[PDB]
Amino acid sequence: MQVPHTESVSLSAGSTVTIKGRPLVCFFNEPHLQVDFHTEMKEDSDIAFHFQVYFGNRVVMNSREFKIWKEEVESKNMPFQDGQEFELSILVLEDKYQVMVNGQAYYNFNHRIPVSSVKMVQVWRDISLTKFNVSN
Amino acid sequence: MQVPHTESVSLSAGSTVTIKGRPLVCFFNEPHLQVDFHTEMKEDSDIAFHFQVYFGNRVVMNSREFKIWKEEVESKNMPFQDGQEFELSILVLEDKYQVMVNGQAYYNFNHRIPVSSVKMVQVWRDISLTKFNVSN
Incomplete structure (x- = not known):
């Protein structure tokens, strides 16, 4: 699975986005993971939900x-x-x-943009990926 | 060329480390580049020189x-x-x-650890690489 990983999506209440991967380096060197829910396929489009993990440290949304x-x-x-491998849902x-x-559940982010505006998800930074699944 | 990129090195005054690569995403999404001069091959070993580029933003050493x-x-x-492709020297x-x-020359970092202690360089974060050359 290619990283950066970019996919078209359609999401509504009840959808799940499942991501399985592994950090590329030890936590001591602070690898990152970024998941961005975009409003268009264009990479510089708006982001309804930005989720950045500083492994071993903190999370920013x-x-x-x-x-x-x-x-x-x-x-x-x-x-x-x-x-370790992680599974994000x-x-x-x-x-x-x-x-x-x-x-x-460890993190929550109230909608600022309607979720019907989300058209793309990008997963990137310092991970390998083996699964990216949007529920049907 | 594999990223993260890890190589054994020996450096002295007069050495040059040349790195050629390209960020994986647009600057608007703030890709990073990290170059670490390590004292041992072990990834969690000490770092004589840590160079982190927040593309489009700032540099931390x-x-x-x-x-x-x-x-x-x-x-x-x-x-x-x-x-753009960049060449770091x-x-x-x-x-x-x-x-x-x-x-x-845009950045300078006075030695805190003797450079004779450096045994490894790691290049990683959000770039592709086409060259990693230590001068002979």
Whole structure:
């Protein structure tokens, strides 16, 4: 699976985006993971949900609206395990995105852009990927 | 050329480390480049010279000594060009590392660890690579 990974999507409440991968280096060297829910296939399009993991450290979430980054949200939840494969499940709920790591919710991000505006997801930074699945 | 890229090296005053590559995404999405001069082949070994480019934004330099990050140095010099191949030349001088971008020096980092302690270089984050050359 190619990284950066870019796919067309359509999401509504009840959708799940499942991502399985592994960091490329040890946590001590702070690899990153970025998942961006875009409003168009164009890479510089707006981002309804930006999810950036600083492995071993913290998580940052934000949106990019009309080309401007908005209010940053930080979390110190760090369920990811050094050297391990992870399974991320991003659940689209009516009110928010909910990010599960290995089956339990650790991060939440209330919708700032309607989820019906999302048309693309990009997964990138310092990971290998083996699965990218949007629920049917 | 594989990224992350890890090579054994030996450096002294007069050595040059040349790196040619291209960012994987547009500058608007802030790709990164990291070059680390390590004291051992082990990935978690100390780092005599850490050079991190936030393309389109800023540069951070530091060292990691006895597993601890030391004093961060920042630069707002940004000669890198969106979408373009770059050639980085890291010159080992008696007093410092000097980083040239496309033939002109834009960043400098005085030695904190003797350069004779460097045994490995790792190049990684959001780039493709076509050249990694240590001068003979």
